[PDB]
């Protein structure tokens, strides 16, 4: 399975690849350890996490990898371009209630209403699903098609483990 550092490697490389593209500045690929810190019992960990993920300089389309430790990856996506109508999406390839709880704690700690988060199907290896979800959605933000009806759907995606491994190689 993929560690936090692999997802960070991949999202750092992706951010490099998307540099200077239309709308690339709207995106923030959260560091997964920082997402985990949102729910820390240490107040300074949580606060720093909030600054890094919900500060006034943090881009409005945020991809949050959700780590169940040595268990399971899922993806929370927050679109707060409209501060009066924040939209949130939870993609989980999969159910006991823990994964959605983590996604809900993350939403709660970013100042959101967790009840509003849409539970989204994905690819109806969970690490690979998250990275593929990020890749696909990011490109939809770039080309504008993210905002069409159905533009956040990942039901049918097929992670290319090879591409992933070859992108993690470079």
* CATH for 1-170, options being 3.40.50.300, 3.40.190.10, 3.40.395.10, 2.40.37.10: 3.40.395.10
Give the domain ranges of the chain. Answer: 1-170
Rounded to an integer, what distance in angstroms lies between the CA atom of residue 32 and that of residue 2?
12
Q: Are 24 and 18 in contact (CB under 8 A)?
A: yes
Method: X-ray
Nearest to 65 by CA among 135, 146, 166: 135
What is the SS3 assignment for 8-72? HHHHHHHHHHHCCCCCHHHEEECCHHHHHHCCCCCHHHHHHHHHHHHCCCCCCEEEEEEEECCCE
H/E run at residue 73? strand 72-79
Strand 61-68 with 72-79, pairing: antiparallel
Rounded to an integer, what distance in angstroms lies between the CA atom of residue 72 and that of residue 78?
20
Rounded to an integer, what distance in angstroms lies between the CA atom of residue 92 and that of residue 58?
24
Q: Are 135 and 13 in contact (CB under 8 A)?
A: no
Q: Which two tokens stand for residue 14?
A: 């992706």
Q: Is 157 helix (H, G, I), strand (E, B) or coil?
A: coil
Measured in angstroms, the resolution is 2.0
Strand 72-79 with 27-29, pairing: unpaired
35 burial type by CB count under 10 A (0-12 exposed, 13-18 middle, 19+ buried): buried
């Amino acid at each position: 399975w993929l560690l936090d550092g692999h997802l960070r490697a991949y999202t750092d490389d992706l951010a490099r690849r998307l540099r200077g593209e239309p709308n690339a500045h709207l995106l923030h690929f959260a560091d997964s350890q920082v997402v985990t810190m949102l729910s820390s019992a240490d107040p300074d960990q949580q606060a720093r996490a909030q600054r890094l993920l919900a500060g006034d300089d943090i881009p409005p389309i945020v991809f949050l990898p959700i780590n169940q430790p040595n268990a399971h990856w899922s993806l929370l996506v927050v679109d707060r371009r409209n501060k009066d109508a924040v939209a949130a999406y939870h993609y989980d390839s999969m159910k006991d209630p823990q994964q959605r709880y983590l996604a809900d704690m993350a939403a709660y700690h970013l100042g959101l209403d967790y009840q509003q988060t849409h539970e989204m199907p994905i690819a109806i290896s969970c690490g690979d699903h998250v990275l593929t979800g990020i890749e696909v959605l990011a490109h939809r933000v770039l080309d504008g098609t993210f905002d069409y009806a159905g533009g956040r759907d990942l039901t049918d995606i097929e992670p290319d483990r090879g591409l992933i491994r070859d992108r993690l190689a470079q």
